[PDB]
Amino acid sequence: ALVEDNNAVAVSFSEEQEALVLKSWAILKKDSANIALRFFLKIFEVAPSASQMFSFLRNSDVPLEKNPKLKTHAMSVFVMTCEAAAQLRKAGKVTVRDTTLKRLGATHLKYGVGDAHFEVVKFALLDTIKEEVPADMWSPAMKSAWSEAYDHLVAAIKQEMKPAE
Amino acid sequence: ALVEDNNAVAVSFSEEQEALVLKSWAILKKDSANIALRFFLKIFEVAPSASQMFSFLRNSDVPLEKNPKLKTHAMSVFVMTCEAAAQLRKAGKVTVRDTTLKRLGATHLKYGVGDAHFEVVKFALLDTIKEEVPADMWSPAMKSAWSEAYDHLVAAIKQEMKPAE
Ligand code: HEM
Ligand code: HEM
C-alpha cells in the first residue's frame, strides 16, 4: 500500500471495524446457504466469464445452483475475509499460513484470475452483505471494514502469484 | 445456439427490441454528459482496474471526471450498441465497416481488454440505463434488448482480436 509504501505498510484496522465485520458475519451465518448463493449469482451477473472458471464436470452439476465448488468457494471468500479482519485487528497484517497462501497464489494464477476478477468478487461480496444485513446495521463503515479485510487478503494472495523479484 | 456470435447466421432481434433501445437511448441523449459520467463511475466502482486502462486526471482543475476522453468512450459504447441493435434488426448481424472493426479489435487487444472487462462494461451499461429511464419503461425486455445488441457488437470486435477464423 502506497500510504507509506516500502516493504512494510501500516495496516491499521480497528476493533470497531472488526466488530462490524464480526456482527454482520454473525447475521450472515444464520443463513449461509442463501448468502453464498446470492453471492455467486452476483459474480455471474457481473462477470459470467468468472463463474466459468469453476465449471462442473466432476460433479456434472450444470445448474449454478448445484455447483458445489460455488458454495464452497463462496464460503471460503467470506470466512477467509472474516478471518483476515480478525488478523488485521490482532496482528496488523494478514496471517494466512505460508503454505496456504502459496496454494492460493498457485491456484488463482493457474485459473487466470486477474485484478478485474478480484474486484468484481469484492463488488459482489459487498453488494451481498448490504443486501443481506438489516438496513439498521449497514453503513459506509461496515462496507469499508469488509473492503479493507478483503483487499489485504487479496494482496497477500497476489504476492504468491508473481515473482518475489 | 449458444455460440458467442453469429457472423451472419440466425439471430432474431425484433423491431420491438430495437424500439426499446431507441426510445430509451432517446431519453438518455437528453442528458448525455450525465449518463456517460454515471456509466464510467459505475465501471470504476465495479472494476477500478478497468478505468485504469484509460487516463488519470487532467481537464479543468476539478477531481470529478471532466476528461473528454471518457465521455467520448462512454458515448461510443452507447451509440455503437444502439446502432448494433438497428443492424441486428435490419440485417440480422452486426454490420460495422470492416475497417472499423479491425481498428476496434486492434485497439482493445492493444489495451489488454478481456472478457471480464467487456462483461463489467455491459453490467455498467445495463445498470446505467435502468437507473436513468423511468421505472415505467424499464423492464426485463428492455434489459435483454440492450444486452443482445451489446453482446453481438462485442463478439464482432473480439473476432478481430484473435487470429483469423
Ligand atoms: C480473497 C478472495 C478469494 C479467496 C479468499 C479465495 C479462496 C479460494 C480457495 C480457498 C480456493 C480453494 C483451492 C485452494 O485451496 O487453493 C480457491 C479456489 C479457486 N478460486 Fe478463489 N478465492 C478468492 C478469489 C477468487 C476470484 C476473484 C476468482 C475468480 C473470479 C476465484 C476463482 C477460483 C477458482 C476457479 C478456484 C479453483 C477452482 C476450484 O475451486 O476447484 N477466486 N479460492
Ligand atoms: C462494445 C463495447 C465497446 C465499444 C463499442 C468500444 C468502442 C471504442 C471505440 C470506438 C474506441 C476508439 C478508438 C478506436 O477507434 O478504435 C475505443 C477505444 C478504447 N476502448 Fe473501447 N469500446 C468497448 C468496450 C471497451 C471496454 C470493455 C474497455 C475496457 C474496460 C474499453 C477500453 C478502451 C480503451 C482503453 C480504448 C483505447 C484508449 C483510448 O480511448 O484512447 N473499451 N473503444
Short mmCIF file of C-alpha atoms and ligand atoms in Angstrom, two decimals:
data_model
loop_
_atom_site.label_atom_id
_atom_site.label_comp_id
_atom_site.label_asym_id
_atom_site.label_seq_id
_atom_site.Cartn_x
_atom_site.Cartn_y
_atom_site.Cartn_z
CA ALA A 1 0.00 0.00 0.00
CA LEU A 2 1.42 3.37 -1.10
CA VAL A 3 0.45 5.31 2.05
CA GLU A 4 3.97 4.81 3.39
CA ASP A 5 4.95 2.05 0.99
CA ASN A 6 8.41 0.49 1.27
CA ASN A 7 8.08 -3.22 2.13
CA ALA A 8 6.10 -2.91 5.38
CA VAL A 9 2.97 -0.71 5.42
CA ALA A 10 0.74 0.46 8.30
CA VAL A 11 -2.19 -1.89 8.29
CA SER A 12 -4.45 -0.08 10.73
CA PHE A 13 -7.69 -1.97 11.25
CA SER A 14 -9.59 -1.09 14.42
CA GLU A 15 -11.57 -3.11 16.88
CA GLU A 16 -14.66 -1.27 15.71
CA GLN A 17 -14.07 -2.38 12.12
CA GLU A 18 -13.51 -5.97 13.21
CA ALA A 19 -16.68 -5.72 15.29
CA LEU A 20 -18.55 -4.51 12.23
CA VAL A 21 -17.30 -7.49 10.22
CA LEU A 22 -17.99 -9.93 13.06
CA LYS A 23 -21.57 -8.94 13.82
CA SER A 24 -22.56 -8.72 10.16
CA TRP A 25 -20.90 -12.09 9.50
CA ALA A 26 -22.75 -13.38 12.57
CA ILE A 27 -26.09 -12.48 10.98
CA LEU A 28 -24.98 -13.83 7.56
CA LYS A 29 -24.09 -17.20 9.07
CA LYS A 30 -27.68 -17.62 10.28
CA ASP A 31 -28.33 -18.14 6.57
CA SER A 32 -25.09 -19.38 4.94
CA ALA A 33 -26.53 -21.42 2.08
CA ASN A 34 -28.62 -18.46 0.90
CA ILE A 35 -25.97 -15.75 1.05
CA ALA A 36 -23.40 -17.96 -0.67
CA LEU A 37 -25.92 -18.46 -3.42
CA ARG A 38 -26.74 -14.75 -3.80
CA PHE A 39 -23.04 -14.04 -3.69
CA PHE A 40 -22.19 -16.27 -6.66
CA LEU A 41 -25.29 -15.29 -8.61
CA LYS A 42 -23.98 -11.73 -8.31
CA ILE A 43 -20.50 -12.70 -9.52
CA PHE A 44 -22.05 -14.48 -12.50
CA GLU A 45 -24.27 -11.46 -13.24
CA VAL A 46 -21.33 -9.09 -13.25
CA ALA A 47 -18.76 -11.34 -14.93
CA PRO A 48 -20.17 -14.56 -16.40
CA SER A 49 -16.66 -15.47 -17.51
CA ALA A 50 -15.73 -15.60 -13.83
CA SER A 51 -18.16 -18.29 -12.78
CA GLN A 52 -16.93 -20.16 -15.86
CA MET A 53 -13.63 -20.79 -14.05
CA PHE A 54 -15.48 -23.21 -11.81
CA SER A 55 -17.17 -25.36 -14.49
CA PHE A 56 -18.91 -28.56 -13.34
CA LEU A 57 -17.61 -31.80 -14.92
CA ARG A 58 -16.59 -33.97 -11.95
CA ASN A 59 -19.94 -33.26 -10.31
CA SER A 60 -21.56 -32.76 -13.74
CA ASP A 61 -23.75 -30.33 -11.78
CA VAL A 62 -24.65 -27.95 -14.62
CA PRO A 63 -27.01 -25.52 -12.83
CA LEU A 64 -25.13 -22.77 -10.98
CA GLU A 65 -27.44 -23.51 -8.06
CA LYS A 66 -25.97 -27.01 -7.80
CA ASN A 67 -22.32 -26.22 -8.46
CA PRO A 68 -20.70 -27.32 -5.15
CA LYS A 69 -17.48 -25.52 -5.99
CA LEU A 70 -19.57 -22.33 -5.96
CA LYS A 71 -20.95 -22.85 -2.45
CA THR A 72 -17.61 -23.94 -1.06
CA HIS A 73 -15.85 -21.10 -2.79
CA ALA A 74 -18.40 -18.51 -1.69
CA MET A 75 -17.93 -19.58 1.93
CA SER A 76 -14.15 -19.53 1.64
CA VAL A 77 -14.17 -15.91 0.49
CA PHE A 78 -16.44 -14.92 3.40
CA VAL A 79 -14.73 -17.00 6.08
CA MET A 80 -11.22 -16.12 5.00
CA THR A 81 -12.12 -12.43 4.60
CA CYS A 82 -13.69 -12.52 8.05
CA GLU A 83 -10.53 -14.16 9.44
CA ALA A 84 -8.37 -11.57 7.65
CA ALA A 85 -10.28 -8.86 9.51
CA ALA A 86 -9.56 -10.58 12.86
CA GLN A 87 -5.92 -10.98 11.83
CA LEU A 88 -5.57 -7.35 10.79
CA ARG A 89 -7.11 -6.45 14.14
CA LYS A 90 -4.78 -8.67 16.18
CA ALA A 91 -1.57 -8.78 14.17
CA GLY A 92 -1.76 -5.81 11.86
CA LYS A 93 -1.38 -7.99 8.79
CA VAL A 94 -3.00 -10.98 7.14
CA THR A 95 -1.60 -14.10 8.77
CA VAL A 96 -2.55 -16.94 6.45
CA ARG A 97 -0.24 -19.94 6.83
CA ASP A 98 2.64 -19.65 4.39
CA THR A 99 1.69 -22.96 2.75
CA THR A 100 -1.93 -21.90 2.47
CA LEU A 101 -1.03 -18.64 0.70
CA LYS A 102 1.32 -20.41 -1.71
CA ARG A 103 -1.50 -22.79 -2.54
CA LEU A 104 -3.91 -19.87 -3.10
CA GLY A 105 -1.46 -18.00 -5.27
CA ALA A 106 -0.81 -21.02 -7.44
CA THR A 107 -4.49 -21.89 -7.77
CA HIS A 108 -5.67 -18.46 -8.79
CA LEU A 109 -2.76 -17.87 -11.15
CA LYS A 110 -3.46 -21.27 -12.66
CA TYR A 111 -7.02 -20.16 -13.42
CA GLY A 112 -6.15 -16.81 -14.89
CA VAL A 113 -7.76 -14.88 -12.04
CA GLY A 114 -6.75 -11.26 -12.52
CA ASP A 115 -7.35 -7.85 -10.98
CA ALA A 116 -10.74 -7.28 -12.57
CA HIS A 117 -11.90 -10.67 -11.25
CA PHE A 118 -10.79 -9.92 -7.68
CA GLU A 119 -12.54 -6.55 -7.98
CA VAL A 120 -15.79 -7.99 -9.30
CA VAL A 121 -15.80 -10.56 -6.49
CA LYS A 122 -15.27 -7.75 -4.00
CA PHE A 123 -18.12 -5.78 -5.54
CA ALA A 124 -20.33 -8.87 -5.31
CA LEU A 125 -19.31 -9.56 -1.73
CA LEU A 126 -20.09 -6.00 -0.58
CA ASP A 127 -23.37 -6.00 -2.54
CA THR A 128 -24.36 -9.33 -1.00
CA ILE A 129 -23.67 -8.16 2.57
CA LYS A 130 -25.57 -4.90 2.05
CA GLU A 131 -28.48 -6.84 0.59
CA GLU A 132 -28.45 -9.37 3.48
CA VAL A 133 -27.95 -7.45 6.72
CA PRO A 134 -30.68 -5.20 8.16
CA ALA A 135 -30.63 -1.60 6.93
CA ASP A 136 -30.12 -0.50 10.52
CA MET A 137 -26.67 -2.09 10.57
CA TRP A 138 -25.32 -1.50 7.08
CA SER A 139 -23.26 1.65 6.85
CA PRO A 140 -20.31 3.01 4.94
CA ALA A 141 -18.19 1.96 7.92
CA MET A 142 -19.31 -1.65 7.65
CA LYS A 143 -18.71 -1.56 3.90
CA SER A 144 -15.18 -0.27 4.44
CA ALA A 145 -14.38 -2.77 7.17
CA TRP A 146 -15.18 -5.61 4.79
CA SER A 147 -13.33 -3.94 1.91
CA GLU A 148 -10.17 -3.47 3.95
CA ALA A 149 -10.20 -7.07 5.13
CA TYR A 150 -10.86 -8.32 1.58
CA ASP A 151 -8.30 -6.04 -0.05
CA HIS A 152 -5.50 -7.13 2.28
CA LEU A 153 -6.31 -10.81 1.88
CA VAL A 154 -6.20 -10.37 -1.91
CA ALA A 155 -2.89 -8.54 -1.75
CA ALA A 156 -1.44 -11.42 0.30
CA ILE A 157 -2.64 -13.93 -2.29
CA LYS A 158 -1.42 -11.86 -5.24
CA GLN A 159 2.01 -11.83 -3.66
CA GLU A 160 2.25 -15.59 -4.22
CA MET A 161 1.02 -15.06 -7.81
CA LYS A 162 4.12 -13.28 -9.05
CA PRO A 163 7.89 -13.39 -8.70
CA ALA A 164 9.18 -12.03 -5.39
CA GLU A 165 11.80 -10.22 -7.53
CA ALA B 1 -27.33 -21.56 -30.45
CA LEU B 2 -25.01 -20.66 -27.55
CA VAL B 3 -22.23 -19.75 -30.00
CA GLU B 4 -20.78 -16.41 -28.85
CA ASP B 5 -21.98 -14.65 -32.02
CA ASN B 6 -23.33 -15.48 -35.47
CA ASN B 7 -21.11 -13.78 -38.07
CA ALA B 8 -24.24 -13.65 -40.25
CA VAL B 9 -26.44 -16.62 -39.28
CA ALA B 10 -29.64 -16.93 -37.18
CA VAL B 11 -30.37 -14.08 -34.70
CA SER B 12 -33.87 -12.67 -34.24
CA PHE B 13 -33.63 -9.12 -32.94
CA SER B 14 -37.11 -7.71 -33.34
CA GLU B 15 -38.43 -4.31 -34.18
CA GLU B 16 -39.85 -4.13 -30.68
CA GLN B 17 -36.42 -4.71 -29.16
CA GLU B 18 -34.87 -2.06 -31.41
CA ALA B 19 -37.67 0.30 -30.45
CA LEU B 20 -36.90 -0.37 -26.80
CA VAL B 21 -33.26 0.55 -27.34
CA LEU B 22 -34.13 3.58 -29.49
CA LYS B 23 -36.63 5.23 -27.16
CA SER B 24 -34.51 4.62 -24.08
CA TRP B 25 -31.44 5.94 -25.86
CA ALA B 26 -33.60 8.87 -26.98
CA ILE B 27 -34.26 9.80 -23.36
CA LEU B 28 -30.62 9.18 -22.35
CA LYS B 29 -29.38 11.56 -25.05
CA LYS B 30 -31.38 14.40 -23.49
CA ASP B 31 -28.67 14.15 -20.82
CA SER B 32 -25.55 12.62 -22.43
CA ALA B 33 -22.88 14.21 -20.26
CA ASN B 34 -24.54 12.95 -17.08
CA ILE B 35 -25.22 9.36 -18.15
CA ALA B 36 -21.72 8.97 -19.57
CA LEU B 37 -20.41 10.08 -16.21
CA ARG B 38 -22.63 7.74 -14.17
CA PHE B 39 -21.72 4.99 -16.60
CA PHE B 40 -17.98 5.25 -16.02
CA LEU B 41 -18.36 5.86 -12.31
CA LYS B 42 -20.13 2.51 -12.26
CA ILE B 43 -17.36 0.76 -14.22
CA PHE B 44 -14.80 2.19 -11.82
CA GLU B 45 -16.88 1.10 -8.80
CA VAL B 46 -17.11 -2.46 -10.08
CA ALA B 47 -13.65 -2.81 -11.56
CA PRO B 48 -11.26 0.04 -10.66
CA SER B 49 -8.53 -1.71 -12.67
CA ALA B 50 -10.74 -1.16 -15.72
CA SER B 51 -10.85 2.61 -15.59
CA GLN B 52 -7.09 2.38 -15.08
CA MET B 53 -6.78 1.39 -18.75
CA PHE B 54 -7.62 4.93 -19.91
CA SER B 55 -6.16 8.11 -18.32
CA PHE B 56 -5.59 9.63 -14.82
CA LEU B 57 -6.85 13.19 -14.17
CA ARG B 58 -6.41 16.49 -16.06
CA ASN B 59 -9.02 18.82 -17.68
CA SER B 60 -10.32 21.95 -15.94
CA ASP B 61 -8.92 21.98 -12.38
CA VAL B 62 -11.53 19.58 -10.88
CA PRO B 63 -11.49 15.99 -9.46
CA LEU B 64 -14.75 14.69 -10.99
CA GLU B 65 -14.16 13.12 -14.40
CA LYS B 66 -14.17 16.06 -16.81
CA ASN B 67 -11.78 14.16 -19.12
CA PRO B 68 -13.33 14.42 -22.65
CA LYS B 69 -11.83 11.01 -23.48
CA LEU B 70 -14.30 9.27 -21.15
CA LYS B 71 -17.43 10.97 -22.37
CA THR B 72 -16.20 10.01 -25.80
CA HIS B 73 -15.76 6.35 -24.99
CA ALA B 74 -18.99 6.17 -22.97
CA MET B 75 -20.90 7.66 -25.93
CA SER B 76 -19.23 5.29 -28.38
CA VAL B 77 -20.41 2.25 -26.41
CA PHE B 78 -23.98 3.60 -26.29
CA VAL B 79 -24.16 4.85 -29.89
CA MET B 80 -22.47 1.80 -31.39
CA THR B 81 -24.56 -0.59 -29.26
CA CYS B 82 -27.66 1.34 -30.33
CA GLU B 83 -26.54 1.02 -33.94
CA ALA B 84 -25.84 -2.68 -33.46
CA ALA B 85 -29.45 -3.14 -32.35
CA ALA B 86 -30.67 -1.40 -35.53
CA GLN B 87 -28.31 -3.56 -37.54
CA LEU B 88 -29.42 -6.78 -35.92
CA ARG B 89 -32.97 -5.68 -36.62
CA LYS B 90 -32.36 -4.86 -40.31
CA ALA B 91 -29.58 -7.23 -41.35
CA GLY B 92 -29.61 -9.92 -38.68
CA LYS B 93 -25.98 -9.31 -37.82
CA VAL B 94 -23.71 -6.51 -36.72
CA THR B 95 -22.67 -4.53 -39.79
CA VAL B 96 -19.75 -2.41 -38.64
CA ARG B 97 -17.47 -1.40 -41.52
CA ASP B 98 -14.73 -3.98 -41.92
CA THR B 99 -12.05 -1.31 -41.36
CA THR B 100 -13.85 -0.04 -38.29
CA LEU B 101 -13.97 -3.49 -36.69
CA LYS B 102 -10.31 -4.18 -37.44
CA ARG B 103 -9.49 -0.89 -35.77
CA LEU B 104 -11.62 -1.81 -32.72
CA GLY B 105 -10.08 -5.26 -32.46
CA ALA B 106 -6.55 -3.89 -32.60
CA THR B 107 -7.26 -1.12 -30.11
CA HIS B 108 -8.87 -3.28 -27.46
CA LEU B 109 -6.33 -6.08 -27.81
CA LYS B 110 -3.59 -3.46 -27.52
CA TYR B 111 -5.04 -2.36 -24.20
CA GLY B 112 -5.48 -5.82 -22.72
CA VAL B 113 -9.26 -5.58 -22.71
CA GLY B 114 -10.51 -9.04 -21.88
CA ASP B 115 -13.78 -10.89 -21.30
CA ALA B 116 -14.21 -9.70 -17.71
CA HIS B 117 -13.79 -6.10 -18.89
CA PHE B 118 -16.40 -6.41 -21.63
CA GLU B 119 -18.71 -8.01 -19.04
CA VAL B 120 -18.23 -5.29 -16.44
CA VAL B 121 -18.87 -2.61 -19.03
CA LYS B 122 -22.04 -4.45 -20.05
CA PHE B 123 -23.10 -4.62 -16.39
CA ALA B 124 -22.42 -0.89 -16.01
CA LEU B 125 -24.28 -0.07 -19.23
CA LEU B 126 -27.37 -2.03 -18.18
CA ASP B 127 -27.23 -0.55 -14.66
CA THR B 128 -26.92 2.98 -16.05
CA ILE B 129 -29.90 2.58 -18.38
CA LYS B 130 -32.07 1.12 -15.62
CA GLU B 131 -31.05 3.93 -13.31
CA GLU B 132 -31.74 6.59 -15.97
CA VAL B 133 -35.00 5.68 -17.70
CA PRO B 134 -38.36 6.00 -15.92
CA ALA B 135 -39.46 2.93 -13.97
CA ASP B 136 -42.48 2.68 -16.21
CA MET B 137 -40.32 1.85 -19.21
CA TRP B 138 -37.55 -0.32 -17.77
CA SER B 139 -38.32 -4.00 -17.99
CA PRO B 140 -36.52 -7.29 -18.41
CA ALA B 141 -37.31 -6.99 -22.12
CA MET B 142 -35.56 -3.66 -22.38
CA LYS B 143 -32.59 -5.07 -20.46
CA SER B 144 -32.35 -8.00 -22.83
CA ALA B 145 -32.69 -5.86 -25.93
CA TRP B 146 -29.65 -3.83 -24.88
CA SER B 147 -27.75 -6.96 -23.80
CA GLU B 148 -28.31 -8.70 -27.13
CA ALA B 149 -27.16 -5.64 -29.05
CA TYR B 150 -24.11 -5.20 -26.83
CA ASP B 151 -23.16 -8.88 -26.81
CA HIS B 152 -23.21 -9.14 -30.61
CA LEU B 153 -21.18 -5.96 -31.06
CA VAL B 154 -18.60 -7.34 -28.61
CA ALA B 155 -18.43 -10.66 -30.37
CA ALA B 156 -17.82 -8.83 -33.67
CA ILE B 157 -14.99 -6.86 -32.09
CA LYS B 158 -13.47 -9.92 -30.39
CA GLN B 159 -13.32 -11.60 -33.78
CA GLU B 160 -10.76 -9.01 -34.87
CA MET B 161 -8.85 -9.58 -31.61
CA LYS B 162 -7.67 -13.11 -32.40
CA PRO B 163 -6.03 -14.71 -35.44
CA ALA B 164 -8.35 -15.27 -38.39
CA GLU B 165 -11.11 -17.86 -38.01
C1 HEM C 1 -9.88 -13.00 -1.45
C2 HEM C 1 -10.69 -13.71 -2.40
C3 HEM C 1 -10.53 -15.06 -2.67
C4 HEM C 1 -10.36 -16.07 -1.77
C5 HEM C 1 -10.20 -15.94 -0.27
C6 HEM C 1 -10.41 -17.30 -2.50
C7 HEM C 1 -10.21 -18.54 -1.92
C8 HEM C 1 -10.10 -19.74 -2.63
C9 HEM C 1 -9.78 -21.01 -2.03
C10 HEM C 1 -9.59 -21.31 -0.55
C11 HEM C 1 -9.73 -21.90 -3.04
C12 HEM C 1 -9.71 -23.42 -2.88
C13 HEM C 1 -8.50 -24.09 -3.53
C14 HEM C 1 -7.22 -23.90 -2.73
O1 HEM C 1 -7.11 -24.48 -1.63
O2 HEM C 1 -6.33 -23.18 -3.21
C15 HEM C 1 -9.99 -21.16 -4.26
C16 HEM C 1 -10.06 -21.72 -5.50
C17 HEM C 1 -10.41 -21.06 -6.66
N1 HEM C 1 -10.73 -19.73 -6.73
FE1 HEM C 1 -10.77 -18.42 -5.28
N2 HEM C 1 -10.59 -17.07 -3.85
C18 HEM C 1 -10.66 -15.70 -3.97
C19 HEM C 1 -10.93 -15.02 -5.16
C20 HEM C 1 -11.18 -15.63 -6.39
C21 HEM C 1 -11.64 -14.94 -7.57
C22 HEM C 1 -11.70 -13.43 -7.78
C23 HEM C 1 -11.88 -15.89 -8.51
C24 HEM C 1 -12.25 -15.70 -9.85
C25 HEM C 1 -13.41 -14.94 -10.26
C26 HEM C 1 -11.53 -17.15 -7.90
C27 HEM C 1 -11.51 -18.34 -8.58
C28 HEM C 1 -11.12 -19.55 -8.04
C29 HEM C 1 -11.06 -20.78 -8.78
C30 HEM C 1 -11.59 -21.02 -10.18
C31 HEM C 1 -10.56 -21.70 -7.94
C32 HEM C 1 -10.06 -23.08 -8.32
C33 HEM C 1 -11.13 -23.97 -8.87
C34 HEM C 1 -11.80 -24.78 -7.80
O3 HEM C 1 -12.36 -24.17 -6.87
O4 HEM C 1 -11.74 -26.02 -7.89
N3 HEM C 1 -11.14 -16.99 -6.60
N4 HEM C 1 -10.23 -19.84 -4.00
C1 HEM C 2 -18.97 -2.88 -27.23
C2 HEM C 2 -18.22 -2.08 -26.29
C3 HEM C 2 -17.19 -1.24 -26.68
C4 HEM C 2 -17.21 -0.36 -27.72
C5 HEM C 2 -18.32 -0.20 -28.75
C6 HEM C 2 -15.99 0.40 -27.65
C7 HEM C 2 -15.62 1.35 -28.59
C8 HEM C 2 -14.41 2.01 -28.61
C9 HEM C 2 -14.00 2.94 -29.65
C10 HEM C 2 -14.84 3.40 -30.85
C11 HEM C 2 -12.74 3.32 -29.36
C12 HEM C 2 -11.97 4.46 -30.01
C13 HEM C 2 -10.66 4.05 -30.67
C14 HEM C 2 -10.85 3.33 -31.98
O1 HEM C 2 -11.29 3.97 -32.96
O2 HEM C 2 -10.56 2.12 -32.03
C15 HEM C 2 -12.37 2.60 -28.15
C16 HEM C 2 -11.15 2.73 -27.51
C17 HEM C 2 -10.81 2.12 -26.31
N1 HEM C 2 -11.65 1.32 -25.58
FE1 HEM C 2 -13.45 0.71 -26.05
N2 HEM C 2 -15.20 0.00 -26.58
C18 HEM C 2 -15.93 -1.02 -25.99
C19 HEM C 2 -15.54 -1.68 -24.83
C20 HEM C 2 -14.40 -1.40 -24.09
C21 HEM C 2 -14.09 -1.98 -22.80
C22 HEM C 2 -14.84 -3.12 -22.11
C23 HEM C 2 -12.97 -1.35 -22.35
C24 HEM C 2 -12.25 -1.62 -21.18
C25 HEM C 2 -12.83 -1.57 -19.86
C26 HEM C 2 -12.57 -0.44 -23.40
C27 HEM C 2 -11.40 0.27 -23.39
C28 HEM C 2 -10.96 1.08 -24.41
C29 HEM C 2 -9.68 1.74 -24.41
C30 HEM C 2 -8.73 1.87 -23.23
C31 HEM C 2 -9.57 2.34 -25.61
C32 HEM C 2 -8.31 2.95 -26.18
C33 HEM C 2 -7.82 4.15 -25.41
C34 HEM C 2 -8.41 5.43 -25.93
O3 HEM C 2 -9.66 5.55 -25.92
O4 HEM C 2 -7.62 6.30 -26.34
N3 HEM C 2 -13.46 -0.44 -24.45
N4 HEM C 2 -13.40 1.82 -27.68
#
